[PDB]
Structures are given as structure tokens and as C-alpha cells.
């Protein structure tokens, strides 16, 4: 009963993209953006036609924009999924002083799962209303159906999302099939934890030890679609990579990292094990969900987010943690390696580790204060902190960038979300005043400049969640475009739009009830990302960044995001 998501006016969008623009291109590259912009949207021109062909599409499609976002967004990606693509849910710490430990855990967090898709497969979960902006209205359930039920097949140039039930078990970079609903009759904790100690007995035998054939599904997209063309020449191949295909997850079986558990090398373990040499093989990332049970009580998921988003996500693993309770040998999958394969695995190894050395992780906690002081400030917590990155960002670099905020647009049909553009004209006036010290801005017109810039902020926030922002009504437009003739028009061919869409810092907020934070890489190479968890009292901001940039820093920036959240503390306290 949800609405179809709204295709906005066309003469807006372009208003609308041109005002987020203009303050972050020269002087002449606008004008001729500007001349580009107008030709495109006159009256009988291509914009018009275009658009009518979208309000055709909105009438024919549940959501208008779905094929077109999810190849952009995901399938057409070429980058090796690790750190550039799938993000991680770090739990809280746990303590397994033994093997035992550990894999009551495991089996305890794995009935867990089954028992959560028996409330999907119910079809009587209860719809989920919006929090904070716009409270109180119904949202899309549909992702919830692509937690479990998913796979990313690589292709050469695009990817494709695609009996009885089991999981699959990574231990030592082996593959087990774990059969858990045997006719729709479920096997129990204790069973699990039986089935458990089986593998890690098993997978501990080096004379049976196959090679680690995970390590492939780390590699860049097309590189990885070759690989596995290879393997799919031998039957017993196939038959491995269909059980991995139908799993309801993966449960890896880690061994433990040699380093400090602090917060920062959790989530390293998470995102990419490490690399080969400890836990980076121990995995498959074409799977939506990897859950990861380490024997020093790290412990997560990796996701393969093509089918979902963060918030949908967590709701799911918090549910999972907080219901958690306190018979045949699993079949081992087996694999043919040709000379060629060999060839594969030690290209996947060395790209694995190049990733592995080149990302730039803090896990940094702003504790001086929290949403609680924000909302004493009449502001929005979400808005201020954005207001706080471009600060930082600017701060730091000196400029303003196109920048990416995660929006959910879950109040229509199959929404997942829209762009944020929080790099706006209003936040350009305010980083100003505050870094240039020769302009002598007093402190009074620089709280009216952060007022001002939160206001903007906070309408372009509503805007992007009603379905009215510019970025998924511009990317269907051109798409249809490419439709009518592989040669684009001028518009987004405009260098113009080419930049508005290389987001160097790239944004969401994930609010968790516990202690589990989420994290992600950047999204160009020198750039950040920046996933952050607002709490009454503190501010968790995870910051990734490349080393192979100079110009980037992740413990830089993180200061600078502090440094500027003090400075609008000390702004908001003046009156
Ligand atoms: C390029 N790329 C794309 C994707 C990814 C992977 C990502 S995938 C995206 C996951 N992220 C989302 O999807 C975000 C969805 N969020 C929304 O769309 C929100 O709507 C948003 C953020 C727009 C606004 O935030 P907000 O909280 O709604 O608004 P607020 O901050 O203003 O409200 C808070 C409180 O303040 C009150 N209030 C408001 N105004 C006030 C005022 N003036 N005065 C006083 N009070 C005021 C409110 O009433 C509320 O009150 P309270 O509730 O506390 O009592 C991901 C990350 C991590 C893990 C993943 C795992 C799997 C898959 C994906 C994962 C990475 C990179
Ligand atoms: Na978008
Ligand atoms: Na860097």
C-alpha cells in the first residue's frame, strides 16, 4: 500500500543540480554548464522527452529507478569487493577462552538465523515505521527478502544479483556444507554446536586441505568472472560453487589475529580478514551475509550490500543478538585446480594484499557530547554532523567536494535510497568564516552562517527522502537516453556532471541500540568514507582512506572532525 516513488518536475532537477554545482566549478566551466543545462531542458527539447518517456516507466514499473540504480550503483562496478564495496558490522567484544566457547557461539548465532527466517518466510512482520525525520510513516519491508536469499554472480562487464536448507562454514580457508532445516524441521543448538566440532576437527587436517578457493572471490569483478569460468569447465567445480550459490550465509571460523583486539583492528579482521596469510581466504564475497565468529571473540558480518542497505541490516543482527539463547559429518567442498587456477589464486593474493596495505582505518569516539546537546541546539543531529564534515573536510584540504549521503527513500515501493548532496552553498559560506582568520568573521554572523547551514541541510534532507532530490531522477534520465543512442547527451557528457559524481567524501549515518558500530571503504582514491553512529552522549565515526594518497589521512581527519566539533559547540554556546 505504499506509494510509487514520485518522478520530480524536470525544470527542478535542473535548477536544483545546477545551484549544488556552481560553488564547486570554475567561473567559465559553469557558464558553459549552464548553456548546456538550458539546451537540454527547453521547451520540446530532449529533457522534455526524456522525461515523458520516465512517466511512462513510473506507470508501467513499481519503482522507476531500481534496474537502473542497482547496475550503477553495484553490478557495473569493476573494483574487487573488499574495502571498496562490502561493508562491515563489527559486534561487541567476546571472550572464548576455549574452542567450546566459541562454537556455542557459532551455533547459538546460527539457530538464531534460522529462527529469523521463519519470521521473513511468516509474511507477518510487522511493518516498519520511519524514525527521526519524518517520523512515524510506513517503509518498504522488501530488503528484509534479500538478507538470505542472494548471490552476486561477476560478469566481464556487469554482475548479476540472482532443497533442503544449509549454511556454509569457512575454517582454514575450507568450505563445509552445514544442513540445518532437514524438511522444514530444524536441527537445534546443541546439534549445531555437534555439527561444529566436526568441521574445525576436520578442517585441521593438513593432508586433506584443499587450496583456498575464496581467495578468487576477492579479486576485481571481471578478473574474478574469468577465474571462475574456469572453474565451471570441471563438474565437481559446479557442483561446489551451486551449494555455496543456494546458502542461507556463510559462518566463518576464524583464527586469531596476532594484534591487539582494540576497535580499529576488529573492524580491519572484518573487512578483509587481514589478507591470505591470515584470515582474508577464510571467505566468499559474492554471499550478501558472511558471518564471522573469530577464536579470539572477534566476531560480525561482511555484507555483500547489493540487495540491502545499513539500517535494514542492523535491525536484523540486533534482532539476531538480542534472541540469541546463551547426524550425518558435514560434506567438505571439493575442488579441480588446473595449472591455470593456480595462476589465479596467486594474482588474487597478491591484489588482496595491495588492498590490505593500502586502507587507512580509525574507529574514533567523540565523547564530549552527543544528539542530546544537538537537539538542546534546535538542530537536527544528522544535519550538524554533516555541517561538521564539511568543516572537517575543509579544514583539512581546503576545499569543498562533491559529497554522498546515504538518504532512504523506503516510504515508496522497493526504495532503497537517494544522494544527499551536503556540499551546498550555504556550507561553503560557513567553512569560509571559520578558516579564514584575515576575514575576522565574528563569532555571532558565524553561528548565523552554521544556523543557515544546518536549515540547508536539513531541506535538502526532506527533499531527498520524499523523493524529490536530483540524483536518481538525472541517472534515469540518462539511462533512457543511452537507450535511444549509446551517445549520451551533452549534459552528461559536461565535465560538470562527470565531477558532481565523484563523491571524494562519501557518508552515511548507522545508529545502533548496542555496541556494534559498521564501517566501509572510500569510493575514489582520494577520498573517505565515513560511516558515523550518533548516541545521547557520543558520536562514533568510523574513517576509511587510501595511504597510497598522499593528500588523505584518516587520524588527520578524524582530529579535524573533532577540532570541528568543538568549534560549533563553542558557536551554538555564544547565545
Ligand atoms: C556510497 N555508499 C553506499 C552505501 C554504502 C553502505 C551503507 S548503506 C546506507 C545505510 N545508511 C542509511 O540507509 C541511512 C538512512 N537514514 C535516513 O534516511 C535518515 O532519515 C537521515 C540520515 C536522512 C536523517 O537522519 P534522521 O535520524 O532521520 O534525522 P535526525 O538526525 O534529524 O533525527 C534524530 C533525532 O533528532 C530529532 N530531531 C530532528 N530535528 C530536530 C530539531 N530541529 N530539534 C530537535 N530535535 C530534532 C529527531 O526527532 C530524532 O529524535 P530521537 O529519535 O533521537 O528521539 C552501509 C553502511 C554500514 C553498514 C551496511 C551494512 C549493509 C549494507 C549497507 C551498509 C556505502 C557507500
Ligand atoms: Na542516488
Ligand atoms: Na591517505
Do not use: V
Given at each position: 500500500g505504499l506509494p510509487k516513488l514520485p518522478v520530480p518536475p524536470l525544470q527542478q532537477t535542473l535548477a536544483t543540480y545546477l545551484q549544488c554545482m556552481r560553488h564547486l566549478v570554475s567561473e567559465e566551466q559553469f557558464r558553459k554548464s549552464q548553456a548546456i543545462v538550458q539546451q537540454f531542458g527547453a521547451p520540446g527539447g530532449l529533457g522534455e522527452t526524456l522525461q515523458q518517456k520516465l512517466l511512462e516507466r513510473q506507470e508501467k514499473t513499481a519503482n522507476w529507478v531500481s534496474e537502473y540504480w542497482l547496475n550503477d550503483m553495484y553490478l557495473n562496478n569493476r573494483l574487487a569487493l573488499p574495502v571498496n564495496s562490502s561493508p562491515a558490522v563489527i559486534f561487541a567484544r567476546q571472550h572464548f577462552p576455549g574452542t567450546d566457547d566459541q562454537l556455542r557461539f557459532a551455533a547459538s548465532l546460527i539457530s538464531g538465523v534460522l529462527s529469523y527466517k521463519a519470521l521473513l518466510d511468516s509474511h507477518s512482520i510487522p511493518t516498519d515505521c520511519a524514525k527521526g525525520q519524518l517520523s512515524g510513516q510506513p517503509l518498504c519491508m522488501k530488503q528484509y527478502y534479500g538478507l538470505f536469499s542472494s548471490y552476486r554472480l561477476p560478469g566481464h562487464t556487469q554482475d548479476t544479483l540472482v532443497e533442503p536448507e544449509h549454511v556454509i562454514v569457512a575454517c582454514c580457508n575450507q568450505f563445509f556444507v552445514l544442513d540445518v532445516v532437514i524438511n522444514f524441521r530444524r536441527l537445534s543448538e546443541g546439534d549445531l554446536f555437534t555439527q561444529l566440532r566436526k568441521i574445525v576437527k576436520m578442517a585441521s587436517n593438513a593432508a586433506a586441505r584443499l587450496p583456498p578457493i575464496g581467495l578468487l572471490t576477492s579479486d576485481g569483478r571481471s578478473e574474478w568472472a574469468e577465474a571462475r569460468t574456469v572453474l565451471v569447465k570441471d563438474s565437481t567445480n559446479r557442483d561446489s560453487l551451486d551449494m555455496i550459490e543456494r546458502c542461507i550465509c556463510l559462518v566463518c571460523l576464524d583464527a586469531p589475529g596476532g594484534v591487539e583486539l582494540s576497535d580499529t583492528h576488529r573492524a580491519l579482521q572484518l573487512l578483509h580478514g587481514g589478507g591470505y596469510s591470515k584470515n582474508?581466504?577464510?571467505?566468499?564475497?559474492?554471499?550478501?551475509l558472511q558471518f564471522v565468529v573469530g577464536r579470539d571473540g572477534t566476531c560480525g558480518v561482511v555484507c555483500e550490500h547489493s540487495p540491502f542497505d545499513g539500517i535494514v541490516l542492523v535491525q536484523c543482527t540486533e534482532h539476531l543478538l538480542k534472541h540469541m539463547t546463551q547426524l550425518p559429518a558435514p560434506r567438505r567442498l571439493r575442488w579441480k585446480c588446473s595449472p591455470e587456477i593456480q595462476g589465479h589464486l596467486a594474482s588474487s593474493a597478491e591484489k588482496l594484499q595491495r588492498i590490505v596495505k593500502n586502507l587507512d582505518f580509525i574507529v574514533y569516539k567523540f565523547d564530549n557530547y552527543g544528539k542530546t546537546f544537538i537537539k538542546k541546539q534546535k538542530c537536527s543531529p544528522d544535519a550538524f554532523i554533516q555541517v561538521a564534515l564539511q568543516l572537517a573536510f575543509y579544514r583539512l584540504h581546503r576545499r569543498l567536494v562533491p559529497t554522498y549521503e546515504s538518504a532512504s527513500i523506503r516510504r515508496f515501493q522497493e526504495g532503497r535510497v537517494d544522494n544527499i548532496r551536503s556540499a551546498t552553498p550555504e556550507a561553503l559560506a560557513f567553512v569560509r568564516a571559520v578558516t579564514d582568520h584575515k576575514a575576522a568573521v565574528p563569532a555571532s554572523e558565524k553561528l548565523l552562517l552554521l544556523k543557515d547551514a544546518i536549515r540547508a541541510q536539513t531541506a535538502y534532507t526532506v527533499m531527498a527522502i520524499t523523493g524529490m532530490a536530483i540524483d536518481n531522477h538525472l541517472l534515469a534520465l540518462r539511462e533512457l537516453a543511452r537507450a535511444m543512442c549509446?551517445?549520451?547527451?551533452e549534459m552528461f557528457m559536461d565535465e560538470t556532471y562527470l565531477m558532481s559524481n565523484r563523491f571524494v567524501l562519501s557518508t552515511s549515518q548507522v545508529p545502533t541500540t548496542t555496541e556494534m558500530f559498521c564501517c566501509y571503504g572510500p569510493v575514489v582514491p582520494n577520498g573517505y568514507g565515513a560511516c558515523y553512529n550518533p548516541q545521547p552522549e557520543t558520536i562514533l565515526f568510523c574513517i576509511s582512506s587510501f595511504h597510497s594518497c598522499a593528500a588523505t589521512s584518516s587520524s588527520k581527519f578524524a582530529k579535524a572532525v573533532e577540532e570541528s566539533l568543538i568549534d560549533m559547540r563553542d558557536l551554538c554556546s555564544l547565545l
Open positions: 582474508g581466504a577464510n571467505r566468499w564475497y559474492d554471499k550478501s549509446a551517445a549520451l547527451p
